[PDB]
Design an enzyme around this catalytic site. Structure first.
Site, PDB file in Angstrom:
ATOM      1  N   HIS B  41     -45.827 -13.709  68.066  1.00  0.00           N
ATOM      2  CA  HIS B  41     -47.191 -14.231  68.255  1.00  0.00           C
ATOM      3  C   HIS B  41     -47.371 -14.929  69.633  1.00  0.00           C
ATOM      4  CE1 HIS B  41     -46.054 -18.469  67.199  1.00  0.00           C
ATOM      5  NE2 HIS B  41     -47.175 -18.762  67.837  1.00  0.00           N
ATOM      6  N   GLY B 143     -45.968 -25.968  70.506  1.00  0.00           N
ATOM      7  CA  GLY B 143     -44.990 -25.413  71.415  1.00  0.00           C
ATOM      8  C   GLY B 143     -43.572 -25.359  70.888  1.00  0.00           C
ATOM      9  N   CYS B 145     -42.155 -23.347  69.019  1.00  0.00           N
ATOM     10  CA  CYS B 145     -41.772 -22.040  68.507  1.00  0.00           C
ATOM     11  C   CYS B 145     -40.697 -21.401  69.382  1.00  0.00           C
ATOM     12  CB  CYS B 145     -43.017 -21.162  68.397  1.00  0.00           C
ATOM     13  SG  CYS B 145     -43.981 -21.707  66.955  1.00  0.00           S
TER      14      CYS B 145
HETATM   15  C1  LIG Z   1     -45.673 -22.117  67.490  1.00  0.00           C
HETATM   16  O1  LIG Z   1     -44.836 -22.880  68.371  1.00  0.00           O
HETATM   17  C2  LIG Z   1     -46.413 -23.018  66.475  1.00  0.00           C
HETATM   18  C3  LIG Z   1     -45.590 -24.263  66.126  1.00  0.00           C
HETATM   19  C4  LIG Z   1     -46.383 -25.061  65.094  1.00  0.00           C
HETATM   20  C5  LIG Z   1     -47.286 -26.076  65.780  1.00  0.00           C
HETATM   21  C6  LIG Z   1     -46.960 -27.432  65.141  1.00  0.00           C
HETATM   22  N1  LIG Z   1     -45.840 -27.186  64.254  1.00  0.00           N
HETATM   23  C7  LIG Z   1     -45.546 -25.888  64.160  1.00  0.00           C
HETATM   24  O2  LIG Z   1     -44.738 -25.396  63.391  1.00  0.00           O
HETATM   25  N2  LIG Z   1     -46.841 -22.311  65.242  1.00  0.00           N
HETATM   26  C8  LIG Z   1     -48.143 -22.126  64.979  1.00  0.00           C
HETATM   27  O3  LIG Z   1     -49.003 -22.755  65.585  1.00  0.00           O
HETATM   28  C9  LIG Z   1     -48.546 -21.123  63.928  1.00  0.00           C
HETATM   29  C10 LIG Z   1     -49.196 -19.871  64.532  1.00  0.00           C
HETATM   30  C11 LIG Z   1     -49.026 -18.595  63.690  1.00  0.00           C
HETATM   31  C12 LIG Z   1     -49.749 -18.684  62.349  1.00  0.00           C
HETATM   32  C13 LIG Z   1     -47.537 -18.337  63.464  1.00  0.00           C
HETATM   33  C14 LIG Z   1     -49.580 -17.380  64.423  1.00  0.00           C
HETATM   34  N3  LIG Z   1     -49.528 -21.718  63.059  1.00  0.00           N
HETATM   35  C15 LIG Z   1     -49.199 -22.661  62.183  1.00  0.00           C
HETATM   36  O4  LIG Z   1     -48.062 -23.105  62.082  1.00  0.00           O
HETATM   37  C16 LIG Z   1     -50.342 -23.137  61.323  1.00  0.00           C
HETATM   38  N4  LIG Z   1     -50.164 -22.815  59.935  1.00  0.00           N
HETATM   39  C17 LIG Z   1     -50.951 -21.910  59.386  1.00  0.00           C
HETATM   40  O5  LIG Z   1     -52.055 -21.621  59.843  1.00  0.00           O
HETATM   41  O6  LIG Z   1     -50.440 -21.216  58.214  1.00  0.00           O
HETATM   42  C18 LIG Z   1     -51.315 -20.449  57.396  1.00  0.00           C
HETATM   43  C19 LIG Z   1     -52.315 -21.348  56.681  1.00  0.00           C
HETATM   44  C20 LIG Z   1     -53.660 -21.359  57.089  1.00  0.00           C
HETATM   45  C21 LIG Z   1     -54.585 -22.174  56.449  1.00  0.00           C
HETATM   46  C22 LIG Z   1     -54.155 -22.969  55.401  1.00  0.00           C
HETATM   47  C23 LIG Z   1     -52.825 -22.962  54.990  1.00  0.00           C
HETATM   48  C24 LIG Z   1     -51.893 -22.157  55.627  1.00  0.00           C
HETATM   49  C25 LIG Z   1     -50.549 -24.630  61.460  1.00  0.00           C
HETATM   50  C26 LIG Z   1     -50.784 -24.978  62.925  1.00  0.00           C
HETATM   51  O7  LIG Z   1     -51.674 -24.984  60.661  1.00  0.00           O
HETATM   52  C27 LIG Z   1     -51.473 -26.055  59.726  1.00  0.00           C
HETATM   53  C28 LIG Z   1     -50.724 -25.586  58.487  1.00  0.00           C
HETATM   54  C29 LIG Z   1     -50.687 -27.211  60.357  1.00  0.00           C
HETATM   55  C30 LIG Z   1     -52.855 -26.541  59.303  1.00  0.00           C
END
Ligand SMILES: *[C@H](O)[C@H](C[C@@H]1CCNC1=O)NC(=O)[C@H](CC(C)(C)C)NC(=O)[C@@H](NC(=O)OCc1ccccc1)[C@@H](C)OC(C)(C)C
Ligand SMILES: *[C@H](O)[C@H](C[C@@H]1CCNC1=O)NC(=O)[C@H](CC(C)(C)C)NC(=O)[C@@H](NC(=O)OCc1ccccc1)[C@@H](C)OC(C)(C)C
Lengths: 306, 306
Positions: B41, B143, B145
């Site tokens: 991603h 960041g 990831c």
């Molecule tokens: C990449 O470095 C990054 C690291 C994260 C940021 C802070 N802590 C981390 O682990 N990962 C992401 O931003 C990641 C992006 C992809 C989804 C992998 C493309 N997004 C998340 O980790 C989100 N989670 C998420 O959207 O999961 C699905 C979901 C959606 C709606 C409701 C429940 C689950 C995070 C940023 O969103 C939160 C779960 C924190 C709200």
């Protein structure tokens, strides 16, 4: 988010960690530039450890009594000189991996990371703190001597600890890198006891903000106390008195959260007077005092190093 | 003696940690030999993250879209290829610091160390475990990831984890190094929930032996239970059922202490049915499940690495 007991990356210290052997004694030593720092009871025997007079023992020694070994390659000693409780072995080569570094003497409350070694080969890395009683709750076996504690501020390694001995209550003791023991312990085998520990209050409050930043908020309240009145309940529970300088360093955290420092003291107050009644803060059933206010900022705003 | 949550030395992994930038997205990537492994991603945008079809997005890309950077020096990409959820960027130089390594896929219960990075520069190292629900209770910011989890067995690094995403209960998720998620989570922004966690029973018992080895013994008793009857109280308290294979791996520890595995199950039993009533085990007010039976041996008999 999330909050873990975290340690500085140990790559730069691993690069200095060597084996020092003398007599029938093997311990670890730290090699920076052309100097190898180890603890001096490497020159003792088992019978010596009872009441050595290290000045005498050391003056019998010659250079060739010191088997130094970096990896497999044998360093050639060409000098020695005892400064307080550390030996300083001048060898014939400078360490190619010598990083930017300095020596520091921390205060109680301040934290650091520990790279435990045996025969020069690192075994683990943990993070802990300099207790109010000048001890550390560490994890050390035989041969663990000469391992160091340290902080890293961008590119620079601040050495603050070397390991010497375990106390009979399972706690540990050692020195700064200039040889001087923290607290009143001596490197010899005669009885000595740590002294009652207290709870580092400023670090508990720093931790409680980390709990707020990460979604844990059940312990908060409307109440507020004045610091005079907090310090009389904190004593009772055998916590460090809180200075106005603590409140100062806690301000930044107080404002990432809009919680007055003086209000967070009122919550801790209730926590001590009632306990915690089935719940956890940050996954711990205890109030946790080994996170500094600058530790919390680190992990919750993501400072890196190089 | 003493017993700390300890992490493998992170020197060897720091040597592989690089910055990968593409579009308006910067994350960390792992450079072994002439290959750079990052999460895919990195090719997404903010609007893409809702339901990407990574095969399409990736086929538009060319090599020159991938700004790879080891320190300050710019790696030249010369190939790419997506395997499950990781990207594999073939560059024009092999990593001089490439250590002995392998890729492994751990089971729930097994533990590992995590080197958290931002922009390629390590920030910390912690030790944690693969929860029964294929999550990890970690500490990650934006960041984070591309950071990895890993074990070191003498000289060899076993990579077992790369970081991708945080779940809304504050827990984390990611993949092995062959791109396959642990558990049923997908790298996209649509709702998904971790699933009820349990307590890794075999690791609690391993930890209780560590408590015995270090002088803590108030929780022991004369009683003994048969494993059928233990597993019916362990269920109740929402602990993993215990296999005879657990008892097998716990034997060594059972005999460094002369405590029958089946007797230690009888103590845990009482601990769950009464709690702990003001006292701590190993300085924790909780039963601790993130120490494996081979973790305990490590720290209590001093295995090193190189
Ligand atoms: C990449 O470095 C990054 C690291 C994260 C940021 C802070 N802590 C981390 O682990 N990962 C992401 O931003 C990641 C992006 C992809 C989804 C992998 C493309 N997004 C998340 O980790 C989100 N989670 C998420 O959207 O999961 C699905 C979901 C959606 C709606 C409701 C429940 C689950 C995070 C940023 O969103 C939160 C779960 C924190 C709200
Ligand atoms: C050097 O590597 C070694 C590491 C210790 C072994 C296990 N954990 C360690 O910290 N340090 C020593 O063996 C050290 C030797 C000197 C005293 C420094 C020369 N000895 C100890 O740590 C002992 N402590 C001790 O004797 O302190 C004084 C004392 C004597 C009698 C009663 C109380 C206090 C340890 C090995 O002895 C125990 C306190 C564990 C009984």
């Amino acid at each position: 988010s999330g909050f873990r007991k975290m340690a500085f990356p140990s790559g730069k210290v691993e690069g200095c960690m060597v084996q020092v052997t003398c007599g029938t004694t093997t311990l670890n030593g730290l090699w920076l530039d052309d100097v190898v720092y180890c603890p001096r009871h490497v020159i003792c025997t088992s019978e010596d450890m009872l009441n050595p007079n290290y000045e005498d023992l050391l003056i019998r020694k010659s250079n060739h009594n010191f088997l130094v070994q970096a990896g497999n390659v044998q360093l050639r000693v060409i000098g020695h000189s005892m400064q307080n409780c550390v030996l300083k072995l001048k060898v014939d080569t400078a360490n190619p991996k010598t990083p930017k570094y300095k020596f520091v003497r921390i205060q109680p409350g301040q934290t650091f990371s520990v790279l435990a070694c045996y025969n020069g080969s690192p075994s683990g890395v943990y993070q802990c703190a300099m207790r109010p009683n000048f001890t550390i709750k560490g994890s050390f076996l035989n041969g663990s001597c000469g391992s160091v504690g340290f902080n890293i501020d961008y590119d620079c390694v601040s050495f603050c600890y070397m390991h010497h001995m375990e106390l009979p209550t399972g706690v540990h003791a050692g020195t700064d890198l200039e040889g001087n023991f923290y607290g009143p312990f001596v490197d010899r085998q005669t009885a000595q006891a740590a002294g009652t520990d207290t709870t580092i209050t400023v670090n508990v409050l720093a931790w409680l903000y980390a709990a707020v930043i990460n979604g844990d908020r059940w312990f908060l309240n409307r109440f507020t106390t004045t610091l005079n009145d907090f310090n009389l309940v904190a004593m009772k529970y055998n916590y460090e008195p809180l200075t106005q300088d603590h409140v100062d360093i806690l301000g930044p955290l107080s404002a990432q959260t809009g919680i007055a420092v003086l209000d967070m003291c009122a919550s801790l107050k209730e926590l001590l007077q009632n306990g915690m009644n089935g719940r956890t803060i940050l996954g711990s059933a205890l109030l946790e005092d080994e996170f500094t206010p600058f530790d919390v900022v680190r992990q919750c705003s993501g400072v890196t190093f190089q």
